[PDB]
Design an enzyme around this catalytic site. Sequence first.
Site, PDB file in Angstrom:
ATOM      1  N   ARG A  50       0.838  -1.208   0.013  1.00  0.00           N
ATOM      2  CA  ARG A  50       0.064  -0.043   0.026  1.00  0.00           C
ATOM      3  C   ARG A  50       0.858   1.268  -0.176  1.00  0.00           C
ATOM      4  O   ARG A  50       0.345   2.153  -0.270  1.00  0.00           O
ATOM      5  CB  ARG A  50      -1.010  -0.040   1.304  1.00  0.00           C
ATOM      6  N   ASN A  51       2.120   1.085   0.397  1.00  0.00           N
ATOM      7  CA  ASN A  51       3.172   2.199   0.715  1.00  0.00           C
ATOM      8  C   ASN A  51       4.304   2.201  -0.682  1.00  0.00           C
ATOM      9  O   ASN A  51       5.164   2.937  -0.644  1.00  0.00           O
ATOM     10  CB  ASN A  51       3.957   2.292   1.860  1.00  0.00           C
TER      11      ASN A  51
ATOM     12  N   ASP B 276       5.096   7.218   2.282  1.00  0.00           N
ATOM     13  CA  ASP B 276       4.684   7.131   3.554  1.00  0.00           C
ATOM     14  C   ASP B 276       5.688   7.145   4.736  1.00  0.00           C
ATOM     15  O   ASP B 276       6.219   5.997   5.077  1.00  0.00           O
ATOM     16  CB  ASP B 276       3.633   6.080   3.841  1.00  0.00           C
TER      17      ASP B 276
HETATM   18  C1  LIG Z   1      -3.159   6.775  -0.788  1.00  0.00           C
HETATM   19  O1  LIG Z   1      -1.667   6.752  -1.161  1.00  0.00           O
HETATM   20  C2  LIG Z   1      -0.915   7.139  -0.460  1.00  0.00           C
HETATM   21  C3  LIG Z   1      -0.342   6.575   0.677  1.00  0.00           C
HETATM   22  C4  LIG Z   1       0.625   6.939   1.444  1.00  0.00           C
HETATM   23  C5  LIG Z   1       1.144   8.196   1.215  1.00  0.00           C
HETATM   24  C6  LIG Z   1       0.749   8.840   0.196  1.00  0.00           C
HETATM   25  C7  LIG Z   1      -0.339   8.457  -0.680  1.00  0.00           C
HETATM   26  N1  LIG Z   1      -0.560   9.258  -1.700  1.00  0.00           N
HETATM   27  C8  LIG Z   1       0.110   9.783  -2.952  1.00  0.00           C
HETATM   28  C9  LIG Z   1       1.251  10.471  -2.568  1.00  0.00           C
HETATM   29  C10 LIG Z   1       2.262  10.980  -3.523  1.00  0.00           C
HETATM   30  N2  LIG Z   1       1.776  11.035  -4.861  1.00  0.00           N
HETATM   31  C11 LIG Z   1       0.433  10.224  -5.274  1.00  0.00           C
HETATM   32  O2  LIG Z   1       0.291  10.272  -6.268  1.00  0.00           O
HETATM   33  C12 LIG Z   1      -0.105   9.779  -4.099  1.00  0.00           C
HETATM   34  C13 LIG Z   1      -1.657   8.930  -4.642  1.00  0.00           C
HETATM   35  O3  LIG Z   1      -2.111   8.100  -3.790  1.00  0.00           O
HETATM   36  N3  LIG Z   1      -1.852   8.905  -5.816  1.00  0.00           N
HETATM   37  C14 LIG Z   1      -3.125   8.313  -6.654  1.00  0.00           C
HETATM   38  C15 LIG Z   1      -3.921   7.600  -6.030  1.00  0.00           C
HETATM   39  C16 LIG Z   1      -4.806   6.886  -6.708  1.00  0.00           C
HETATM   40  C17 LIG Z   1      -4.799   7.127  -8.038  1.00  0.00           C
HETATM   41  N4  LIG Z   1      -5.998   6.465  -9.067  1.00  0.00           N
HETATM   42  C18 LIG Z   1      -5.220   5.388  -9.823  1.00  0.00           C
HETATM   43  C19 LIG Z   1      -6.178   4.659 -10.729  1.00  0.00           C
HETATM   44  N5  LIG Z   1      -7.317   4.317  -9.945  1.00  0.00           N
HETATM   45  C20 LIG Z   1      -8.404   3.273 -10.782  1.00  0.00           C
HETATM   46  C21 LIG Z   1      -8.166   5.456  -9.303  1.00  0.00           C
HETATM   47  C22 LIG Z   1      -7.275   6.273  -8.219  1.00  0.00           C
HETATM   48  C23 LIG Z   1      -3.858   7.942  -8.682  1.00  0.00           C
HETATM   49  C24 LIG Z   1      -3.046   8.445  -8.044  1.00  0.00           C
END
Ligand SMILES: COc1ccccc1Nc1cc[nH]c(=O)c1C(=O)Nc1ccc(N2CCN(C)CC2)cc1
Length: 303
Positions: A143-144, A157
């Site tokens: 997940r990270n 994270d």
């Molecule tokens: C939720 O994810 C995280 C977990 C821990 C720390 C940070 C994050 N989030 C971060 C941190 C930095 N950059 C990113 O792009 C993200 C992130 O979550 N991006 C991110 C999340 C989801 C998507 N979609 C992918 C296609 N799907 C079908 C729909 C959602 C696209 C980009």
Amino acid sequence: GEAPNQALLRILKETEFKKIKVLGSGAFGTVYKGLWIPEGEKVKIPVAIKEATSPKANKEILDEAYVMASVDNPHVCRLLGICLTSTVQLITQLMPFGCLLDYVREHKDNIGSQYLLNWCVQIAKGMNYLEDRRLVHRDLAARNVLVKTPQHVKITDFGLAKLLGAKEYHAEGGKVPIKWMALESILHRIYTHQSDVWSYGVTVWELMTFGSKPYDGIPASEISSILEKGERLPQPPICTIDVYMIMVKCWMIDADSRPKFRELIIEFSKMARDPQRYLVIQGDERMHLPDMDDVVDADEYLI
Ligand SMILES: COc1ccccc1Nc1cc[nH]c(=O)c1C(=O)Nc1ccc(N2CCN(C)CC2)cc1
């Protein structure tokens, strides 16, 4: 004494960047998709913006900002800057494919052995970088691990990440992810680069099982005794004894017996040169995964 941390913390104006949509709205906070247009630089950088105001939450977000500003590696998530609005926003590179856990679950039927083993090498590279930087992650899991492109992943994270000086980190309380934790971490709250190795083993297991939950249905309290008996996660069907043995080694009681990240890079690289000898996936090889005028990726936006 100890080496001065000369990292540069960049402060960004709320006007320099434009939010587009919400990517995730977790209990902790929200993550937005956006575009960062610096000064008069004629560039558009696709970003992720991670934001009631409470002094304690700001202290923690600024602590994560400190850690992220202090790391620079192709396989580690890079901090672009912070925006000092009512609530402090972390601005980071957009990883457009989201987390690896969801990605493997969503693309099971198109993920080949080459990709799995390359991800393993990439995570070990990023992890070995943190080791060089004397940084104990404490929350490594599928997940990270964010997906820039299906061929390029990065560790994220740094909420629990701790910096060392002269061998282990002794924690306090706080909610911790038991199913990814080394035995010493569960029984004594001790975290080391070798405890990250245990978590690395679980992360690899998550990938090889295409996103299965470790110890599905077993409560976190039971885990400690399950591990003490000498029980580990099962061999994923696609895994040869060669790959599963690497996983098993990451799960030794003796932390010094576990592999070093630099060894994990080597081991997985040799395997990545002939992926079909190490992972057995039905229908492998035939499988394949994937104003914009001035758009530039953060990896190409240096200063
Ligand atoms: C939720 O994810 C995280 C977990 C821990 C720390 C940070 C994050 N989030 C971060 C941190 C930095 N950059 C990113 O792009 C993200 C992130 O979550 N991006 C991110 C999340 C989801 C998507 N979609 C992918 C296609 N799907 C079908 C729909 C959602 C696209 C980009």
